[PDB]
Amino acid sequence: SFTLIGEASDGSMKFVYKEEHPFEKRRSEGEKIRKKYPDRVPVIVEKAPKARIGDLDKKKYLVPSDLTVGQFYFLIRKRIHLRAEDALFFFVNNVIPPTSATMGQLYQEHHEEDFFLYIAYSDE
Amino acid sequence: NSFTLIGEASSMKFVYKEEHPFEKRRSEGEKIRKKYPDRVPVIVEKAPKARIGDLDKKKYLVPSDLTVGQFYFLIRKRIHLRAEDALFFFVNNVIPPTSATMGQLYQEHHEEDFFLYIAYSDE
Amino acid sequence: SFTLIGEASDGSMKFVYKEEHPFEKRRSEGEKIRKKYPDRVPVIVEKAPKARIGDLDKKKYLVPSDLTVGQFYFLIRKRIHLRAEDALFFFVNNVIPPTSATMGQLYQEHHEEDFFLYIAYSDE
């Protein structure tokens, strides 16, 4: 018989950052930081609820637009002290982006109206 | 000053297809696709040249929205191999992008028995 | 309250191989090896000076055209004796290729007039 492996991921990701700040406060912050750092993009990075890896101390990042998703994985891996064997996946609107995509490209395609890009992370 | 030659070049014949007749395969694939419409049936086999272990079970049902990269960890934990060992997956002898979904690979590449065949190897 | 993470690369990279071997000699060698091994591609692999990881002993490789970037990463990591936790990225003309790209496709796109493909590697 077949062996079932893996589970679908619910699209129900809520972000503490969106819960803790009204829209216009977020938009004002995102607009101002895009003016101050025009070669970076503001990204909210938060743990998916079924993730079985560590928490991030900070959620609000400023990442160079020209860095790839792959480069960003390593920078985040280092902050959650992941063992090399441990998985790490980013999801934007519940979809894992290609590792060769740049953060600027992802931001242009998927930032919200508050000027933030939202990324959930998980080990599965 | 001399060139250093490394790596080896790579169609694979899956022993599963020799072990089970086509019509029994197809009947099963059609049945399981109706039973689990949000999963895809996959046959996973080791490439003969791989120096890592074989899987006990070959037949898996994976969520269509799962990626190859996610699938990698679900299968790697079921193989006997060392941390130092590589693991690569092939569909029709090509390594897919890690962000490709299993449902997309199934839609493009499932055979006429409605299974997706995936090989794995080390390096 | 933003956390700056990662740095942009300014794209500066020279290859010691080119400094040390005249163009005409490089071109004749690359032409000759492509005739003899038509299913392999000649690659020069060098560490970016800014990288804080180990250097390679050998820089001139001859790899199957159908080998992927991912397969080549695994071999080069081993040759450098990289810690599992350290990152390794390849750059071709300052762009990280997709891990599923083949070396033959990168060679076709980016080999120079000496018939070599030049790859830099770094930890970031």
Numbering used by the authors:
A (entry chain C), C (entry chain A): -11 to 112
B (entry chain B): -12 to -3, 0 to 112
Sentences from the paper on this structure:
Initiation of macroautophagy/autophagy is mediated by the ULK1 (unc-51 like autophagy activating kinase 1) protein kinase complex and the autophagy-specific class III phosphatidylinositol 3-kinase complex I (PtdIns3K-C1). The latter contains PIK3C3/VPS34, PIK3R4/VPS15, BECN1/Beclin 1 and ATG14 and phosphorylates phosphatidylinositol to generate phosphatidylinositol 3-phosphate (PtdIns3P). Here, we show that PIK3C3, BECN1 and ATG14 contain functional LIR motifs and interact with the Atg8-family proteins with a preference for GABARAP and GABARAPL1. Two hydrophobic pockets, HP1 and HP2, in the Ubl domain of Atg8 ensure binding of the side chains of the φ and η residues of the core LIR.
In a similar manner we mapped the minimal LIR motif of BECN1 to the 5-amino acid sequence of FTLIG. This putative LIR motif is adjacent to the BH3 domain of BECN1 (amino acids F97-I100). The putative core motif of BECN1 (FTLI amino acids F97-I100) was also mutated (F97A, I100A) and tested for interaction with the recombinant GST-Atg8 homologs. The mutations significantly reduced binding and confirmed a functional LIR motif in BECN1. If that did not work we made a chimeric protein consisting of GABARAP N-terminally fused to the LIR sequence with a Gly-Ser linker. We obtained high-resolution crystal structures of chimeric proteins consisting of GABARAP N-terminally fused to the LIR motifs of PIK3C3 and BECN1 with a Gly-Ser linker, and LIR peptides from BECN1 and ATG14 co-crystallized with GABARAPL1. The LIR motif of BECN1 (FTLI) is also a canonical F-type LIR motif. It displayed an even higher sensitivity towards substitutions in all the 4 core LIR motif positions than seen for the PIK3C3 LIR and other analyzed LIR motifs. In each of those 3 structures we observed some hydrophobic interactions between the residues C-terminal to the core LIR motif in position +4 to +6 (V255 [PIK3C3]-P256 [PIK3C3]; G101 [BECN1]-A103 [BECN1]; P439 [ATG14]-P441 [ATG14]) and HP2. BECN1 only bound with significant affinity to GABARAP and GABARAPL1.
